Amino acid sequence: SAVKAARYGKDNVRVYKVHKDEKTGVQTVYEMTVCVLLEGEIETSYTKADNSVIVATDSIKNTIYITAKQNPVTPPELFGSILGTHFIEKYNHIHAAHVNIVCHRWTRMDIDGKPHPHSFIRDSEEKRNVQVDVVEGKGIDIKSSLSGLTVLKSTNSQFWGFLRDEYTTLKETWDRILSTDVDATWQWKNFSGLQEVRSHVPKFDATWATAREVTLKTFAEDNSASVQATMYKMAEQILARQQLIETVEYSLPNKHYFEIDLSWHKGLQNTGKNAEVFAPQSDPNGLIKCTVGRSSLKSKL
Amino acid sequence: SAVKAARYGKDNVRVYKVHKDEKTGVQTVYEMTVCVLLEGEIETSYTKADNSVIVATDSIKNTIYITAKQNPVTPPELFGSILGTHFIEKYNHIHAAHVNIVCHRWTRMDIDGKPHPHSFIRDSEEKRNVQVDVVEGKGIDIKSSLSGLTVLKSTNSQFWGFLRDEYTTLKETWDRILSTDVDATWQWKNFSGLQEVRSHVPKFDATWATAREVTLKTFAEDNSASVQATMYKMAEQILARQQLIETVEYSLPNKHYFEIDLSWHKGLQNTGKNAEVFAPQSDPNGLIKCTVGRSSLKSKL
Amino acid sequence: SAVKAARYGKDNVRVYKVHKDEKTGVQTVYEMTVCVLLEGEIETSYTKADNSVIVATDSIKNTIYITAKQNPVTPPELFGSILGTHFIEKYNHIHAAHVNIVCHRWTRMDIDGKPHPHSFIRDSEEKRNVQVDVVEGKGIDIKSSLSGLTVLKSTNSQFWGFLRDEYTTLKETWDRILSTDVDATWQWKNFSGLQEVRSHVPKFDATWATAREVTLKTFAEDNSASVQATMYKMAEQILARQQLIETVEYSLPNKHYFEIDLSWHKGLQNTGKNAEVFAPQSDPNGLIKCTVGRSSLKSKL
Amino acid sequence: SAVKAARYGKDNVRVYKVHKDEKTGVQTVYEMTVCVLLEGEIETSYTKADNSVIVATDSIKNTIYITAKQNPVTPPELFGSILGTHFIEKYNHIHAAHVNIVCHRWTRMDIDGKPHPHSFIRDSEEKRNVQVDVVEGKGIDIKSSLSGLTVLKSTNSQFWGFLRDEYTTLKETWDRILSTDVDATWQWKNFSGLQEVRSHVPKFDATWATAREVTLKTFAEDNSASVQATMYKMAEQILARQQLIETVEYSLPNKHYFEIDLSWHKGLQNTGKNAEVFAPQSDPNGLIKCTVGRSSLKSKL
Ligand SMILES: O=c1[nH]c(=O)c2[nH]c(=O)[nH]c2[nH]1
Ligand SMILES: O=c1[nH]c(=O)c2[nH]c(=O)[nH]c2[nH]1
Ligand SMILES: O=c1[nH]c(=O)c2[nH]c(=O)[nH]c2[nH]1
Ligand SMILES: O=c1[nH]c(=O)c2[nH]c(=O)[nH]c2[nH]1
């Protein structure tokens, strides 16, 4: 037997950081959950009880907090890159660091129409995430995402013209509810190292903002032929607006809202044009995925 | 043996309703989860296998949807009162209906600075709830609440002067983080029936808005001596602003954020005035409760 | 305004304890989650920022661990009674202690047919719980329970003869699935204090075992007329087997499994006697409750 | 822009099946949650609003239930293979089917020491899973797993000899608690199609049983040098016992239980040899992974 793959580290490391402007009194907070998993010449910890090669997971935890003390934690793409780079630079025998960060929302409160200097609300469980893979000799691979963005539109969604055979019972519709939880990921061009990441720092917040804006506006405005067709439009727009992205991925549940036929009760009409009351379905759900990149086809387009 | 208490019905009934203004095109959505439990002369279903006294839970479910089709679902205090009243009026042998409603947020999207006519975002997992107990011969008892309102302030919270004995290790502090999930409940004066509830309908949304506003502003502005002292101020203000409330209850976790001493590492200073990076604690948590009403003491105040 | 009710303390205190028999090598583990909330002359912490009356929640936490170090943690009824008694005895101004304990399962592993001396499996998320209310001058009120005991029977459940009117669509059935999550609570006679609790210590584990045994055997063997009828039989049996119990409460969801008509596809027969494949329903669910005590009726029985 | 990857289908499809032996009266139940995602010539549903290429997710759902009606649902490796094969055979333009199955435990109750013919208990939230990828022209790739197997040992775990530098605070230990949630995956040799899967059917249940047995016995008996060293022993044993497995993967959290120094209180000794009461830590947690295969090194072993 032999070790074909191995990584290890610390998961679920909750981290808060505050910035205090002593001049203005304005405080700003950041909260995340961090995972760091390391790879390298560690196989003998598994095969030979050789712990000398293990940077303790507790030490990885300490290092996350120290790194947060000594560096900005925003944008998370930068913080993850700094953190991952540290492990491959500090430890000769560690050759990859895999850093996942979930950023939690703390949005400044407005009180009597004025932004409060030190009070915040969790205005959504929507997350902003990164996955930063720092691989010695192969640079820094970053996937950025937003997730848990839950939306619904009450009309201007359709679904007809799908394949019909002996397994099909679904009625075509020209007017339905569409609701989903948006998970959208943009994959950056490979960066050669931390310097290149730093050189693009403003692009991280800007591209997250673009992705969120495009998602919301396209969802709201597209008279949707299908989840497939709508999500493709989102992805193509995001690619058009940031050339340093290589791909955009969406993963979207179709969270079904079923009509309720009430005509058995006093002839009540609650279907089609008269549909007002619906039954949200917890499960099952459609699940629709795609990864969109830029075309290289020059014939048969 | 004998039945000392019994209630039964349907829980976790998910309900959506849409309102469509055909003139303007503006659609408005409502989503809730409903529980209805009935009491009455039902003991023989338990003791004698006498199902004749059971209004099937499936029928209770049907009735929830029918009631939502035939009535407004807002404010939830009204919808719950209509629904509960139905069961005690329709069925001679049913003498109480207990209606719990959780209202889910669907906030209209703004797209390019304009409110969208039919697209919505779950802008928070904060809920607005009601508990409506319709008891034949004893009117309608309503508790209204907001829950899952998660907030944090980064300073202007203190905790000192608490009891110190041989069980005490906690250091006094004059500057800490305070974070909580607000569960706030206001208990209405007993209503004699559905007519009286209807007579007060505008007060329901108004008092929910007041409770939320007072909660947020007091949290943000109180230089807090303790969770106890801050929550009391919230409750007293809400009581002062709605005379048809009898009590206000708060239940508040103290979701601790611990300082991290890093002085063992290169003399890094991250405590007291230099505290920037903190460890959010998932558990344990303080839990602080009180119910505030109006005073009737005339001496020894 | 005035404080009508108040309690405060520490929730979600995770506690593990090990017992080691040094002679035999056998180790035994206990794990729980504890909440302690105190009441007393504490109103001025809310009204006057008077923290002198507050036993810090952190100190309550310390006290939970110290109490676990100095006392058995089993049965939980005893541990909770010791813990609650401590607070009302130690602090003159504290007049009630409310102790909730959730006990987590760590069942000893059998390895090659022999019980292992120090290895355990979480063999179920079923819990054993207590709620111990220690009230100065009014003794110790204990509710014991089992919860999260999830069961299913594939036949020998029926539901017919229920009320049928214009709200009813449910078909009568003489053969259905019944599945539930059992929450069963037995309420003890008031105890005068810790001595009386100690005097009954063996009864706690014995009555929990009885409740669990009766629940399982009655569920398995009753050709059930309804959830109502089956749960009543459980409760009456438990009352008959422990005279120091005053009431038994059950709260049971009816976790529905729906037949799936497949006759639209190649005439497949999957209903009634030919029903093999079912759709488990996550929501909604029936919810059936009752509290059973001993009868005092001497006429009209 | 162009579609680089796409798959879509139905997730969270809950399925129950009963088998009834009419001779003996013994009934046996199976419950799972199923996801099926399809790939193929479907890009135009995304790019051109061409729904003709979409087998509706609702139809995929219907097909899951029909397949369960017409075939055994056990072992899940077989059921998933049948289900995935159906989609690539039925639809010319569908070229892959990805079938994930989570199997839920329904263990037959013993009542008065005898197995009950139709009553079951959810004896653990441990799952048995499969991931079956049916790819036209490339056969059937199966990963089998067990997950959510939660275990603890109270001694015979150690962790010393790890790297120590300026980031290290963790004390070496020669006696600690070890607790984890076991996620173990065995990856089968590629199968050429459904016939080859059928030819190995008995191996599926047998290898799951082996994996579970090896996991439990190794956990219980290994005087563990680290999570790394223990998990490697598990994997190598499983590989040795089934030649049709290519790799075994473990993913194991180290769910920490911290000692509690109580020496500040009355000199109580609760560390080292006197450690009895511990604080289970919800987060953070170590996370340790490896994939083990068979060696092909012939020099420098
Ligand atoms: O937008 C949709 N896409 C699908 O692939 C699908 N399948 C289905 O049942 N409903 C829908 N809706
Ligand atoms: O505001 C607080 N109230 C308490 O009762 C308490 N107890 C504690 O440990 N911290 C705090 N903080
Ligand atoms: O056992 C049951 N009790 C009910 O009260 C009820 N109501 C219902 O719809 N199904 C059932 N089943
Ligand atoms: O078994 C362990 N492996 C590690 O890699 C590690 N790191 C750590 O902090 N504790 C442990 N324990």
Query: DSSP string of A55-121?
Result: B-HHHHHHHHHHHHHHS---SHHHHHHHHHHHHHHH-TTEEEEEEEEEEEP-EEEEETTEEEEEEEE
Whole-angstrom distance, CA of residue C274 vs CA of residue B268: 72
Per the CB < 8 A criterion, the answer to whether B111 and A216 are in contact is: yes
**Cβ pair B167:D264 closer than 8 A:** no
Q: Calculate ∠ Cα B145-B13-C144, nearest 5°.
A: 70
For B56, the closest chain C residue by CA position comes to C162
The closest alpha carbon to B145, from B245, B228, B61, belongs to B245
**Cβ pair B166:D265 closer than 8 A:** yes
Handedness of CA B184, B189, B195, B201 (dihedral sign): negative
**Cβ pair A10:D169 closer than 8 A:** no
The number of helix segments (H) and strand segments (E) in chain A equals: 6, 12
Q: Is A168 on the interface with B (CB under 8 A)?
A: no
**A256 in ligand 1 pocket by Cβ < 6 Å?**
no
Q: Cβ < 6 Å from ligand 3: which residues?
A: B 8, 54, 56-58; C 159, 170, 226-228, 254, 286, 288
- Encoding tokens for residue A50? 């050789």
Whole-angstrom distance, CA of residue D270 vs CA of residue C66: 10
For residue B160, what are the β-bridge partners?
none
Structural domain boundaries of chain B? 1-301
| Ligand in closest contact with the CA of D38 | 1
Shortest alpha-carbon distance between residue A168 and chain C (Å)? 9
Helical ranges in chain A per DSSP H = 43-47, 57-70, 76-90, 194-199, 201-221, 227-241
Does the annotation count A114 as an active-site position?
no
**Residue at C147: amino acid letter:** S
Torsion of CA B101, B102, B107, B108, to 10 degrees: -30
**Cβ pair B167:D265 closer than 8 A:** yes
Q: Is B168 on the interface with D (CB under 8 A)?
A: no
Q: In terms of residues, how long is chain C?
A: 301
Nearest by CB: C120 against D29, D152, D156: D152
Whole-angstrom distance, CA of residue B100 vs CA of residue B197: 16
DSSP state letters, chain C: -EEEEEEEEEEEEEEEEEEE-TTT--EEEEEEEEEEEEEES-HHHHHS--GGG-B-HHHHHHHHHHHHHHS---SHHHHHHHHHHHHHHH-TTEEEEEEEEEEEP-EEEEETTEEEEEEEE---S-EEEEEEEEETTS-EEEEEEEEEEEEEESSSB-B-S-B-STT--PPPBSS--EEEEEEEEEEE--BSSHHHHHHTHHHHHHHHHHHHHHHHHHHHH--BS-HHHHHHHHHHHHHHH-TTEEEEEEEEEE--EEE---TTTTT---SGGG--EEEE--S-EEEEEEEEE-----S--
Spatial CB neighbours of D221, under 8 Å, sequence gap ≥ 6: C111
Interface test with D, best of C62, C112, C122 (most D CBs within 10 A): C122
Which of A227, A285, A287 should be mutated for ligand 1, with most atoms under 8 A from CB?
A227
Nearest by CB: D7 against A45, A161, A289: A289
Q: Is C151 on the interface with D (CB under 8 A)?
A: yes
Q: Between A and B, how many CB-CB pairs are < 8 A?
A: 161
CB contacts of C62 in chain B (<8 Å) are 167-169
The residue behind tokens 């015979």 is D156
**D157 in ligand 4 pocket by Cβ < 6 Å?**
no
Shortest alpha-carbon distance between residue A24 and chain D (Å)? 35
Q: Is C168 on the interface with A (CB under 8 A)?
A: no
> Ligand 4 center to residue D284 CA distance, Å?
12
The region that residue D172 occupies, defined by phi over 0 for left and psi between -120 and 50 for alpha, beta otherwise, is: beta
**A230 in ligand 1 pocket by Cβ < 6 Å?**
no
- Indicate which residue of B44, B57, B74, B247 is catalytic: B57
Q: Which chains touch A (3 or more CB pairs under 8 A)?
A: B, C, D
> Ligand 3 center to residue B258 CA distance, Å?
49
**Cβ pair A220:B125 closer than 8 A:** no
- Assign A299 to helix, strand or coil: coil
| Ligand in closest contact with the CA of C164 | 3
State the resolution, in angstroms.
Answer: 1.4
- Encoding tokens for residue A118? 């030190």
Shortest alpha-carbon distance between residue D279 and chain C (Å)? 5
Q: What is the CA radius of gyration of chain A?
A: 24
> Ligand 4 center to residue D187 CA distance, Å?
26
Q: Ligand 2 atom 1: the closest Cα is on which residue?
A: B226
- Encoding tokens for residue C238? 């438990």
Q: What is the CA radius of gyration of chain D?
A: 24
For residue A258, what are the β-bridge partners?
A279
| Ligand in closest contact with the CA of C50 | 2
**Residue at C199: amino acid letter:** S
**Cβ pair C121:D27 closer than 8 A:** no
Does the annotation count B57 as an active-site position?
yes
Interface test with A, best of B11, B13, B18 (most A CBs within 10 A): B18
Side-chain-facing half-sphere of D7: CA atoms under 13 Å: 14
Per the CB < 8 A criterion, the answer to whether D64 and D15 are in contact is: yes
**C225 in ligand 2 pocket by Cβ < 6 Å?**
no
Q: Is D262 on the interface with C (CB under 8 A)?
A: yes
Does the annotation count D150 as an active-site position?
no
DSSP class of residue A52 equals G
DSSP class of residue A243 equals T
Whole-angstrom distance, CA of residue D108 vs CA of residue A17: 51
Distance of CA D217 to the CA centre of its chain: 18
Which of D227, D251, D257, D258 should be mutated for ligand 4, with most atoms under 8 A from CB?
D227
Nearest by CB: D262 against C69, C106, C155: C69
Whole-angstrom distance, CA of residue C10 vs CA of residue D234: 41
Q: Is C264 on the interface with A (CB under 8 A)?
A: yes
Q: Is C216 on the interface with D (CB under 8 A)?
A: yes
Q: Which fold has domain A1-301?
A: Urate Oxidase (3.10.270)
Q: Which atom of ligand 1 is the closest one to the Cα of A157?
A: 1
- Helical axes C201-221 vs C227-241, angle rounded to 10°: 150
**Residue at A135: amino acid letter:** V
Interface test with B, best of D165, D255, D282 (most B CBs within 10 A): D282
Whole-angstrom distance, CA of residue B216 vs CA of residue B149: 9
Whole-angstrom distance, CA of residue D97 vs CA of residue D37: 6
The reply to whether B63 sits in an annotated binding site is no
CA distances in angstroms from A242 to A161, A190, A210, C265, listed in the order given: 34, 14, 9, 49
Burial of A58 (0-12, 13-18, 19+ CB in 10 A): buried
Q: Is D57 on the interface with A (CB under 8 A)?
A: yes
- Indicate which residue of A44, A57, A74, A247 is catalytic: A57
Interface test with A, best of D57, D178, D183, D239 (most A CBs within 10 A): D57
| Ligand in closest contact with the CA of B157 | 2
CA distances in angstroms from D125 to A273, C51, C291, D181, D251, listed in the order given: 44, 45, 29, 11, 17
Count of Cβ atoms closer than 10 Å to residue A240 Cβ: 13
Mark the breaks in chain D: residue after which each occurs, C to N over 2.5 Å: none
Count of Cβ atoms closer than 10 Å to residue C244 Cβ: 12
Whole-angstrom distance, CA of residue B155 vs CA of residue B160: 15
The residue behind tokens 């036209």 is D136
CB contact residues (below 8 A), chain B span 231-260, against chain C: 231-232, 235-236, 239-240, 247, 249, 253-254
Q: Please provide residue C264's backbone torsions phi and psi, each rounded to the nearest 5 degrees.
A: -65, -20
Q: Active-site residue numbers of C?
A: 10, 57, 256
**A177 in ligand 1 pocket by Cβ < 6 Å?**
no
Q: Is B69 on the interface with A (CB under 8 A)?
A: yes
| Ligand in closest contact with the CA of B227 | 2
Distance of CA B155 to the CA centre of its chain: 26
